[PDB]
Amino acid sequence: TPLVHVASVEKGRSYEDFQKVYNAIALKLREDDEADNYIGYGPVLVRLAWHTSGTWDKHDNTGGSYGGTYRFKKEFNDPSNAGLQNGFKFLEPIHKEFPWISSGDLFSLGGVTAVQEMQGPKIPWRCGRVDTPEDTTPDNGRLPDADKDADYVRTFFQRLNMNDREVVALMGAHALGKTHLKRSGYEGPFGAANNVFTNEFYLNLLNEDWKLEKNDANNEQWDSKSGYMMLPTDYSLIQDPKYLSIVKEYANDQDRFFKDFSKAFEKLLENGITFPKDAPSPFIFKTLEEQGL
Ligand code: HEM
Numbered sequence: 001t002p003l004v005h006v007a008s009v010e011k012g013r014s015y016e017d018f019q020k021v022y023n024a025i026a027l028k029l030r031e032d033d034e035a036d037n038y039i040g041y042g043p044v045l046v047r048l049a050w051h052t053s054g055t056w057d058k059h060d061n062t063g064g065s066y067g068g069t070y071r072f073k074k075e076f077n078d079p080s081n082a083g084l085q086n087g088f089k090f091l092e093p094i095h096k097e098f099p100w101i102s103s104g105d106l107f108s109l110g111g112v113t114a115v116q117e118m119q120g121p122k123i124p125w126r127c128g129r130v131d132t133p134e135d136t137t138p139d140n141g142r143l144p145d146a147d148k149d150a151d152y153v154r155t156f157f158q159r160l161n162m163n164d165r166e167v168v169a170l171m172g173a174h175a176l177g178k179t180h181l182k183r184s185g186y187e188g189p190f191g192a193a194n195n196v197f198t199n200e201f202y203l204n205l206l207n208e209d210w211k212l213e214k215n216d217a218n219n220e221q222w223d224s225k226s227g228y229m230m231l232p233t234d235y236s237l238i239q240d241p242k243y244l245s246i247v248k249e250y251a252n253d254q255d256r257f258f259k260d261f262s263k264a265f266e267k268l269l270e271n272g273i274t275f276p277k278d279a280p281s282p283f284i285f286k287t288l289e290e291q292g293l
Pocket residue numbers: 043044046047050083144145146147153170171173174176177178179180181183184185186231233265
């Protein structure tokens with residue numbers, strides 16, 4: 001039997017405590033509005049949560065969000081994580097304000113807060129991740145390659161126990177922010193609204209005119225007449241006929257896309273964690289806007 005990670009709620013903490021940590025991330029998001037040319041820290045926090053979760057292997061329960069291992073040099077220096085140090089740095093003063101929260105809880109809560117605060121769906125979220133030692137840090141190379149096709153994508157995500165719908169849903173996070181040539185070898189915004197969470201990823205894939213080109217690091221990307229880009233793995237969602245059908249469904253139903261993404265994103269952030277029968281129910285946090293804050 002693989003490793004077992006039992007959710008253990010930070011001693012004495014309840015929903016109100018975590019709503020505070022959320023509110024502090026949310027306030028700071030509002031505050032550092034100007035970053036990445038007025039994109040903000042929203043997207044990088046969404047990406048930080050996915051990457052700290054996306055090391056999971058279903059086969060042996062190694063990696064995943066539970067251990068908060070990104071805080072160790074091997075994981076924070078992962079070439080795939082280039083840039084994410086900004087997300088870490090952003091969450092640093094949050095963690096000094098709320099030092100009782102585990103690292104895994106913080107990184108994953110950062111992703112939740114970012115989505116909700118960019119007008120994304122509500123993402124139920126559970127506390128109880130527990131910091132694990134350095135020797136538990138997963139090796140580099142577990143996050144995906146961008147220069148690949150649909151067959152790669154489908155296989156890759158099987159290791160995260162994600163099916164076709166879950167893959168297409170999670171990839172709509174590429175409505176957010178942009179690629180940076182210095183970080184990934186790709187350059188450009190994915191779409192128009194860079195820090196507002198919509199189903200624009202699917203609509204753009206279908207409606208724009210894309211042209212495959214070599215960028216300034218000699219990597220291939222799909223470039224639109226409108227000035228957007230897609231990764232080869234992004235564009236594969238319309239080259240594969242099963243993916244294409246789901247792309248069309250999300251392009252044509254914002255509510256279903258929100259619903260599906262919420263489920264898949266909670267699932268991604270919870271993979272590898274055992275929650276006790278007596279654990280609290282997932283928390284649905286209020287936005288600042290819903291609190292009047
Ligand atoms: C086939 C799978 C995926 C590949 C190959 C991939 C690859 C990439 C690359 C190369 C970048 C640009 C990094 C940079 O230069 O700043 C990027 C950005 C981003 N990714 Fe993905 N990604 C994948 C799936 C996902 C998923 C599942 C999520 C979250 C649910 C996600 C969220 C993001 C976000 C928010 C950004 C923009 C961050 C920013 O603006 O700094 N990606 N992705």
